[PDB]
Nucleic acid binder design. Structure first.
Ligand SMILES: C[C@H]1COc2c(N3CCN(C)CC3)c(F)cc3c(=O)c(C(=O)O)cn1c23
Ligand SMILES: C[C@H]1COc2c(N3CCN(C)CC3)c(F)cc3c(=O)c(C(=O)O)cn1c23
Ligand SMILES: [Mg+2]
Ligand SMILES: [Mg+2]
Ligand SMILES: [Mg+2]
Ligand SMILES: [Mg+2]
Ligand SMILES: [Mg+2]
Ligand SMILES: [Mg+2]
Lengths: 482, 209, 482, 208
DNA sequence: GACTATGCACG
DNA sequence: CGTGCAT
DNA sequence: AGTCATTCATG
DNA sequence: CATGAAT
């Protein structure tokens, strides 16, 4: 009927249970592919369903429901909001979901509910899933014990640093900002060649974060500090021009703001400064951003000290903020604070496992085939007696047995031979088959090398990272300043 | 609730009455903020022919409509004192959008006639097809030189402005009361208390095939 | 630029569209299967996904999502609510959806959101869909033009009368009460034999509605008017009993209440009668209903006239209400007020098209197969010649032409032969094929008869309707009083 | 009133059910024995009574209505004899977040109604994991299968038989054993300071 | 996750 | 007023 | 289809 | 005072 437990014990089996799960399976990105579980499931499920960049948008609610019923046993709001976020290009440096409809704005207005919008994976998101079908990554049973899901994606680009992550669990939080794809890949490639590389040298390739929202990042040494330790405070400041209006008045024009800042709240707080006259000078605040351009006009009064006003806004609004690195990720099942070096190196080791696994898989396929093609080449030399033998067999299983015993074919070859359609007996061209046998042998040699020789493999990995860069590289948005 | 225009000008500015908050957002994003204002209508609008003027004054959508249009309602309605030169009804192209127009129209007819008589009430025309074409005929022509839009919620803000909100790129129906008697017997049969007349109007005019 | 339109023109055009749509495709059931479009879609969709009664529940959100992305372009709440209703056994006499979890109550409290609940088609819902894969029912393209959906279901029982419908569009509304499955089927079977049967006779099989919620139905006269014209006003009175209590105090106990009535409100309104002392003698009111039985106890005071109280509650509360038939359904694309005869014959005519289509489809399948089987029977006696002739051919097509020209096989026979797997040259039993040949001839004859003779087909309808009645019959729940 | 009250007032056998979620709250209302069982749905994670201020803590709906539904007041102005239930029963999902919720309620009852937890009045229902069995061992004895994801996937019928019926149920009874090592545990897991917690996790949580 | 308002026909 | 698909 | 509040960590 | 997956 009733069993006692201590207050001290109850609060122990519970908070441990919760703590472990929120750290491993909710708030914190995997260090290799840079995804929280909800995002990986989102991407995996949409990809399983062929809802890719090259096909028609699919209703958001259909996608969300499948994710919920197959992989992610939580609310649809949370799944949907997560899916929506991965589609907002002012939050993601390289978006992984393309969404048709109101998916929010820099002003932070609610996205349309999932009954209105429609979605599909972006092309680049395809590269996170590249080769997932090739037994390249470890799979587990879903909550349901009905279906397998991947525990990490193949990640053909270094998404952890490229898109970032944030980041609140129990006993740990995470803040990793986004970086430029070409830059992060240049660093990875250098490190593949020079494994013991030092931060100073890595920063010749990866000078610092690259926000989708652009702006100005100030703090070379804190950037360095963060790349070494995973912690660091940097300054992020709006791009600003001044415009000399008629009649001796000036006007400050903002065109890029700090990452994670709600444009509309910022505009209101700056106008609050004007309405309250905390500092003198501001004539009018005017948000002039249209569908193709961010532009805020802070018109000043005649004989207004524009440097004073600007500086004050920099300090007392989010026109300028501090950004704090707190790079925590999940490495071998546990939370790690990590700098640029463990991040890139984990990624490199991950791609290694991936490429090795991919290659075992293709080689396996190529062998099974080569083995059959070898049997068929043989069969043709003895067609008449092989048909006779099957004619004399009692049934399928007896026919296979007789082919093994009388002519040494293996099971796999016997199965192939015996499941041929009658019309195949019209063929006697061994040459076409021999061409195939040769192409398979070459294919197997390439793959087997990759597997047996570390250098051959690392070249492949560089060759593939450069392709990804050539394809998806775009220019820096955020300027760097000492 | 309302998203006002950036500068006040009762001669240019436009009021978009938009079906639902979600499409409200897509129009807030794609508008020209200098002269276009957005007022999203949450839900089916109140049938102002079937209901009491009391309960009608108690309706949120109505109360905030007579207020942002800023000219009071009914027989105390002064058009000169209006706030916009164009009131634009922008719904989905689904049957329910048709219904919402119906309801709104019978409001501007019953309690703000002057605004509809002076031809200041319009109806936007979102594109049915995206290959953009508005008529099934324009559809077979683009295929010469397809996403079939199920509503304003499947359009991106840039797409919206381009096709329907942009004063240069768009087409609009201008509601024009051309025969006062034949338009009274029409809003009454359709939107009024009596149910038999309506059943018969449906029976006479709606071909089920 | 713009284009002018008349108010009278614009309005008529718009309300035209809304009227037609909300009449044909929203608020009113098709007279044959008794489903509103959203209900058909729910069933069809779940059924296509194999979410049937014989398999695991499946998260509701997944079902609603597929429904919303393949068939029904409306809100998830409308779809989920409809799905929910079909699972409530106090609204449906024969529930068509089984739901695990909080699916609501007779107290009208909210069902759990679709993220919480799981569902599947009920076993009887299976019978509405039976033979849908056999081209028995007209299909149309969905809003996508990506997929075909059914415009009506096969309906192997008369769902319209059995589960009812209700019912509010433009210019028309509908209320059709639920009925006992076996009684409806008895009526239908009679009318199949006696196509001109009149109400009074049908009413020997179908005496009146049968609510899931039970109670007493008073009004034989108005039932006939309803079954005759489509409209009628019958009475519905709560089943009740009296219990004796100590201290010479009697107690009124209600064990069944009127269809569509919310138990919680009814219990408050009755208690309002006590509080307002509207009739003398009420000590206390109490809902004693629990998971296995409805039970409202109305404890009376000592020298209290139990006949006065009971009667007053009947008149002035909903312990007794009036129910109004207003049977309207979509027939040949337009709304139609209908009595029992239009309904049952529309059903009979529909079951006819279905069995005829079903039979053509199966006959065609059997003929095609028979044709192959005749070929294979011939082949076995020339097996070696046929093998030799195939070896002698240049390729597949040359093999077939040689089979046709040398042995007069047809194109379809040759194709079958030439695509047999080698191992079948072991399975060489002509008697087994002859057994199949005979089975097939017999099958084709039975089916031919059905297609060529109206009586044989009506007999097949009766025999099926009876299998369903035998399998799903339940006792009346509501009593009748003239 | 978010609450669903027991029909008759009996502080000697009455039971208060704090259920994670309005949804599960529904099944609880439907499956209960209404004579002596009341239902209180908690809507969302309960406020952390250690971290938050006694100002905001008392301006909280979930907290404020338990302070009332329980009928004994709170803090040092608290009488255990003016109570309303013999047993207060916390019924959450058998998941991680249910674990979390049990944790935030336990710390409230400890910090602000210690006597109730001291008289062994606070409990924790144990909903079934499998379909019934609770242990990974009990399913193998049945082997000679549906896995429950929440109370929201449970029918009112089943919920009763399995976890609400005083005849067929198992309730862990919270007992404050060593007040001082219990005070260390709550104050470390739920307190304002992060480093203590982080270390408690680093030390006690087996990641593998 | 509950709550909030409308349309539409009908007693 | 309350019903049930819709917004 | 918005709106309301709570956890968790951090500056 | 936000942030973003969770309730
Ligand atoms: C279309 C939106 C319109 O707004 C709605 C409501 N409001 C109308 C305006 N009032 C000011 C406040 C309340 C409402 F009360 C309920 C619903 C609702 O259940 C719902 C749905 O999809 O199920 C959708 N909507 C609703
Ligand atoms: C689990 C439920 C719990 O209740 C919720 C809220 N409340 C908590 C209690 N408050 C007194 C009133 C507000 C809330 F404000 C927002 C959400 C919400 O966004 C949400 C979701 O699934 O996305 C789910 N829930 C919410
Ligand atoms: Mg939420
Ligand atoms: Mg600042
Ligand atoms: Mg729509
Ligand atoms: Mg709704
Ligand atoms: Mg009555
Ligand atoms: Mg849960």
């Amino acid at each position: 009927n009733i069993q006692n437990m201590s207050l001290e014990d109850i609060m122990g089996e519970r908070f441990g249970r919760y703590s472990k799960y929120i750290i491993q399976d909710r708030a914190l990105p995997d260090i290799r592919d840079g995804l929280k579980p909800v995002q990986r499931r989102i991407l995996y499920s949409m990809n399983k369903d062929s809802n890719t960049f090259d096909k028609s948008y699919r209703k958001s609610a259909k996608s969300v429901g499948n994710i919920m019923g197959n992989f992610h046993p939580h609310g649809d709001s949370s799944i949907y909001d997560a899916m929506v976020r991965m589609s907002q290009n002012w939050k993601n440096r390289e978006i992984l979901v393309e969404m048709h409809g109101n998916n929010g704005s820099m002003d932070g207005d609610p996205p349309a509910a999932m009954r209105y919008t429609e979605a599909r994976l972006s092309e680049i998101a395809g590269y996170l899933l590249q080769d997932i079908e090739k037994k390249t990554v470890p799979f587990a049973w879903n909550f349901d014990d009905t279906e397998k899901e991947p525990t990490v994606l193949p990640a053909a680009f270094p998404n952890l640093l490229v898109n970032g992550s944030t980041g609140i669990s129990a006993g740990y939080a995470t803040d990793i900002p986004p970086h430029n794809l070409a830059e992060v890949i240049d660093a990875a490639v250098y490190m593949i060649d020079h494994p013991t590389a030092k931060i100073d040298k890595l920063m010749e390739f990866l000078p610092g974060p690259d926000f989708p929202t652009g702006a100005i990042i100030q703090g070379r040494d804190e950037i360095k500090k963060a790349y070494e330790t995973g912690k660091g405070r940097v300054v992020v400041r709006s791009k600003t021009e001044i415009e000399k209006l008629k009649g001796g008045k000036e006007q400050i024009v903002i065109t890029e703001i700090p990452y994670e800042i709600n444009k509309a709240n910022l505009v209101k707080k700056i106008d609050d400064v004007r309405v309250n006259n905390k500092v003198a000078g501001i004539a009018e605040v005017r948000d002039e951003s249209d569908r193709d351009g961010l532009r805020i006009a802070i018109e000043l009064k005649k004989d207004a000290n524009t440097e004073l006003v600007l500086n004050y806004l920099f300090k007392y609004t989010d026109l300028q903020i501090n950004y704090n690195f707190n790079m925590v990720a999940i490495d071998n099942f546990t939370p790690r604070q990590v700098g640029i070096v463990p991040i890139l190196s984990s990624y490199i080791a991950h791609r290694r496992e991936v490429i090795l696994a991919r290659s075992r898989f293709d080689k396996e396929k190529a062998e099974k085939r080569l083995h059959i093609v070898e049997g068929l080449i043989r069969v043709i030399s003895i067609l008449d007696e092989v048909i006779a033998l099957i004619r004399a067999s009692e049934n399928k299983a007896d026919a296979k047995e007789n082919l093994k015993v009388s002519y040494d074919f293996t099971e796999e070859q016997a199965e192939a031979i015996v499941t041929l359609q009658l019309y195949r007996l019209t063929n006697t061209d061994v040459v076409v088959l021999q061409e195939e046998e040769a192409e398979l042998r070459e294919k197997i040699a390439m793959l087997a090398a990759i597997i047996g020789d570390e250098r051959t493999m690392y070249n492949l990995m560089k060759k593939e990272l450069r392709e990804v860069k050539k394809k998806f590289a775009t220019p820096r948005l955020s300027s760097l300043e000492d | 609730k309302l998203t006002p225009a950036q500068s006040k000008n009762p001669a240019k500015n436009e009021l978009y009455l938009v079906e639902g908050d979600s499409a409200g957002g897509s129009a807030k994003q794609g508008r020209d903020r200098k002269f276009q204002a957005i007022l999203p209508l949450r839900g089916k609008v109140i049938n102002t022919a079937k209901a009491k003027m009391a309960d009608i004054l108690k309706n949120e959508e109505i109360n905030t409509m007579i207020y942002t249009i800023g000219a009071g309602v009914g027989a105390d309605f002064s058009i000169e004192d209006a706030n916009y030169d164009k009131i634009i009804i922008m719904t989905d192209a689904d049957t329910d959008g048709a219904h919402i127009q119906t309801l709104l129209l019978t409001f501007f007819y019953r309690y703000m006639r002057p605004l509809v008589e002076a031809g200041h009430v319009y109806i936007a025309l979102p594109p049915l097809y995206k290959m953009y074409a508005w008529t099934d005929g324009e559809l077979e022509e683009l295929r010469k030189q397809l996403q079939r839009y199920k509503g304003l919620g499947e359009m991106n803000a840039d797409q919206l402005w381009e096709t329907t909100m942009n004063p240069e790129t768009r087409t609009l129906i201008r509601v024009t009361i051309e025969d006062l008697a034949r338009a009274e017997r029409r809003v009454n049969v359709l939107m009024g208390d009596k149910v038999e007349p309506r059943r018969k109007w449906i029976e006479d005019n709606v071909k089920f095939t």
